[PDB]
Paper text:
Resistance nodulation and cell division (RND) efflux pumps are secondary active antiporters that are ubiquitous across all domains of life.
In contrast to all AcrB samples, that contained a mixture of several trimeric states, OqxB showed a homogeneous structure with all particle classes representing the same state. Based on the electron density map of the OqxB trimer, a structural model was built with 2.8 Å global resolution. However, in all three monomers of OqxB all channels leading to the PD, including the exit tunnel, are very narrow throughout their entire length with a bottleneck radius between 1.1 Å and 1.5 Å. These channels are too narrow to fit any known OqxB substrate. Thus, the cryo-EM structure of OqxB has the typical architecture of the O state, but with a closed exit tunnel and will hereafter be referred to as O*O*O* state. In contrast to the O state observed in the crystallographic TTO structure, the O* state of OqxB has a pronounced shift in the PN1 subdomain, which is likely the reason for the closed configuration of the exit channel. On the other side of the spectrum, OqxB adopts a single trimer conformation, the O*O*O* state, in which all binding pockets and entrance channels are closed.
Author numbering:
A (entry chain C): 49 to 336
B (entry chain C): 577 to 720
C (entry chain C): 769 to 912
D (entry chain A): 721 to 816
E (entry chain C): 1009 to 1040
F (entry chain A): 49 to 144
G (entry chain B): 193 to 240
Write the structure that this text describes.
């Protein structure tokens, strides 16, 4: 679970405890553990007796979470709680790196999240794919408090403006059956109100200034996209690289998963850009 | 198992920049040592929990095939653990891989000190400090 | 790209460096102007746990270590840790084994059941086949 | 025999945000009118025969049969007047 | 490997000298 | 799933695609198929290999749908998503 | 109800006040990630 901006004590008090109360008493449960970090993410691991069906364990735990789901805060509730059967230890790590340093942190991290993660997650026997040190790919509007205050706006005003100007609406169809006499044609109607690009988001109107000029979103905030523009932190040897972690599902064969991931990565490397290379130096399966 | 598990624990409140500087030192020490094939570093990733923490790090030291070296894993681990003990910025460590892959984070024992009496986080912290001292005093045991 | 992604709003990094940045945030009052929030909030330093770990529904702290096999064995180390637990840890707090250490403690005296039963089964089979009570004794006496 | 067909007529109604702002009609008012008159609007529930059934609000059939009817839907501007929405939506025909 | 090799080496040396002695002793005790 | 007033294109984009994203990857799966009509109703069928237990697969697919609950629009959310094991062919028809 | 009505307050007025003065707020940390330079410290903020 994720609670953005919440300190570890609040997460454990308000999120971990309600979840643990619902999760206890699950059949064949050995022990459970919860770790809440300052990053706003709570991880709860439930360990079952050996021989327990991993599929039955997941659905039972996921159903307990859905019950406690109403007790959780709205911010935690909005993002959702993910329950997955998953080995708590790394099975294989795939590294993406530029041999001559052609690309920066943003390019490789975005490539892994957009064009590597989804392909790997589709493989059988995969429990979870994690890009270490990389955030999620999303809109990120970096407000400037001084600029917003100068324009005569507050943080709530800015947020509400983009909530109402990016909405989805359905518009029915023409010539419906409630007509007194039968119609000849039926045409669907498409009403669109969503936004897709940074320039579209930068064009969101906040207010009309005293001079008649329309205050757009880009006037006060640094609009950005991607999974995070901060410098690369994961390393291979001593160079900079993007580490992709693969956790096997319980009961899945480790040998087959390592082969499947390596086979898929070979296929993906065919359409790799120039000076882009991949390797998997860390693989306990090869010892097996 | 042709690899070792290492980590670091910087003083509380340290930024990720300080942790990364020490982690890059451990990766240099590891690759310098003979018998080490590679070094995979994850600054900000806790070794014992795999959760993000600013003042912790994780390094995986790959080892060459058994015929390519005259040192066993325990000798390499002891050599690295002695060298990384010279880093004064933060506490460093290195452990052997767990006997059963997929069960445990490393070799040795593993326990949790539960606080069932509501004594608070301060009392729980004191017990950890007391327990680590006693374990260090016992001969034949390393620092937990 | 045919997908769906979230939208987040937050102040930029440079405007969240020091405590003075917090006090300089501006909020609209009833009359319609903007005033800093520093005049209505109090900021002070406090210490707390990070990360917060809960094991089996209670606050807990993990502990991982290893011992020299030539000086102390895994079974000996676990027993030595239990006696330290009842000696140092105050009332209301205790240790709990996890990962392989949980399996090591959970398993019973598995050598103490199968070894005598297998010897008894072998003795009975020999007596049945060879029609004697003392002849099988000549065979099973070499097992010790 | 195939049930696939890609020549089904459809109507695309694009809302001109800048034109709507100049006209003085809020997007929430503009989108809500389309969502209710043309598309079915779910209001709340009501009880009959010991069971719970929905309550639906939508425009009648005769006033929902042509493009002119869509352009003749009226919204409330910032000055409180009734204005047809045909001056802020670019109604167009498409196929899919 | 060291467990079974040491055990079988000891068993072979002990078995060749103790089993005939065990058989004779028990049979004589029964026929006493 | 139902989306009153939405055309088949958007339903295949903001409804069917998020569901297919979370549904793909179940054990013993053979093939899947999703159909989104002009009535605003989306139907997705997941077919498993013969001999698979229907009960265990039914809860799994429902769990996958719950995992993608947040991706769905609010209008779809308030009507709910129904996941049921079901034969896609008629067994018997009663005429009144 | 007599005392609430004496002050000119309704039941909705009281309920609204309590749910807007007892809320949970998250304040993140200082010296966070999007800085253009490497920070020397990172401290969490506990806004209650």
């Amino acid at each position: 679970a994720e609670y953005p901006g919440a300190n570890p004590k609040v997460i454990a008090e308000t999120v971990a405890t309600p979840l643990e109360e619902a999760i206890n008493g699950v059949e064949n449960m050995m022990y459970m553990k919860s770790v809440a970090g300052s990053d706003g993410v709570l991880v709860t691991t439930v360990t079952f007796r050996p021989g327990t069906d991993p599929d039955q364990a997941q659905v039972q735990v996921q159903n307990r979470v859905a019950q406690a789901e109403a007790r959780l805060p709205e911010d935690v509730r909005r993002l959702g709680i993910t329950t997955q059967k998953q080995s708590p230890t790394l099975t294989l790590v795939v590294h993406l790196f530029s041999p001559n340093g052609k690309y920066d942190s943003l390019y490789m991290r975005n490539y892994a999240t957009l064009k590597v993660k989804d392909e790997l997650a589709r493989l059988p026997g995969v429990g979870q794919i994690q890009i270490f040190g990389s955030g999620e790919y999303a809109m990120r509007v970096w407000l400037d408090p001084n600029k917003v205050a100068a324009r005569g706006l507050t943080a709530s005003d800015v947020v509400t403006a983009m909530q109402e100007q990016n909405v989805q609406v359905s518009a029915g169809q023409l010539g419906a059956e409630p007509l007194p006499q039968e119609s000849d044609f039926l045409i669907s109607i498409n009403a669109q109100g969503r936004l897709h690009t940074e320039e579209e988001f930068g064009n969101i109107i906040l207010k009309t200034a005293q001079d008649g000029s329309l205050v757009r979103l880009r006037d006060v905030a640094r609009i950005e996209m991607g999974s995070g523009s901060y410098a690369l932190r994961s390393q291979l040897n001593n160079k900079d690289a993007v580490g992709i972690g693969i956790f096997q599902s319980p009961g899945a064969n480790a040998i087959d998963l390592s082969n499947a991931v390596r086979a898929k990565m070979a296929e993906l490397a065919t359409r790799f850009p120039e000076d882009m290379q991949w390797a998997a130096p860390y693989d306990p399966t090869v010892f097996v | 198992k042709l690899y070792l598990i290492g980590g670091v624990k910087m003083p509380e409140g340290s930024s990720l920049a300080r942790t990364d500087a020490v982690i890059r030192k451990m990766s240099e020490i590891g690759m310098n040592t003979e018998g080490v094939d590679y070094a995979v570093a994850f600054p900000g990733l806790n070794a014992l929990q795999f959760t993000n923490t600013p003042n912790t790090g994780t390094v995986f030291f790959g080892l060459k095939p058994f015929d390519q070296r005259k040192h066993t894993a325990a000798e390499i681990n002891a050599e690295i653990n002695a060298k990384i003990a010279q880093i004064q910025q933060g506490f460093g460590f290195s452990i052997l891989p767990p006997p059963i892959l997929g069960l445990g984070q490393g070799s040795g024992y593993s326990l949790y000190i539960q606080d069932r009496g509501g004594l608070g986080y301060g009392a729980l912290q004191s017990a950890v400090n007391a327990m680590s001292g006693a374990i260090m005093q016992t001969p034949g045991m390393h620092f937990p | 790209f045919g997908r769906t992604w979230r939208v987040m709003a937050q102040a930029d990094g440079p405007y969240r460096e020091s405590v003075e940045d917090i006090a300089n945030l501006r909020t609209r009052n009833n009359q319609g102007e903007m005033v800093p929030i520093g005049s209505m909030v109090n900021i002070s330093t406090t210490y707390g746990p990070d990360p917060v770990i809960r094991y089996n529904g209670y606050p807990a702290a993990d502990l991982i270590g290893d011992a020299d096999p030539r000086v102390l064995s895994s079974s000996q180390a676990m027993t030595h840790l239990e006696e330290l637990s009842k000696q140092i840890l105050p009332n209301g707090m205790n240790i709990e084994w996890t990962d392989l250490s949980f399996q090591q403690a959970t398993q019973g005296n598995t050598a103490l059941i199968v070894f005598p039963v297998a010897v008894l089964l072998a003795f009975l089979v020999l007596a049945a086949l060879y029609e004697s009570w003392t002849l099988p004794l000549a065979v099973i006496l070499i097992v010790p | 025999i195939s049930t696939y067909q890609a020549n089904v007529p459809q109507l695309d109604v694009q809302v001109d945000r800048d034109k709507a702002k100049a006209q003085g009609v809020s997007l929430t008012e503009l989108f809500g009118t389309l969502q209710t008159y043309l598309g079915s609007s779910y209001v709340n529930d009501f009880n009959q025969f010991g069971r719970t059934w929905r309550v639906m609000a939508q425009a009648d059939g005769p006033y929902r049969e042509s493009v002119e009817d869509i352009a003749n839907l009226r919204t409330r501007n910032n000055q409180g007047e009734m204005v047809p929405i045909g001056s802020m939506v670019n109604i167009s025909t498409t196929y899919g | 490997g060291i467990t079974v090799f040491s055990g079988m080496l000891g068993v072979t040396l002990f078995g060749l000298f103790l089993t005939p002695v065990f058989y004779v002793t028990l049979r004589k005790l029964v026929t006493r």
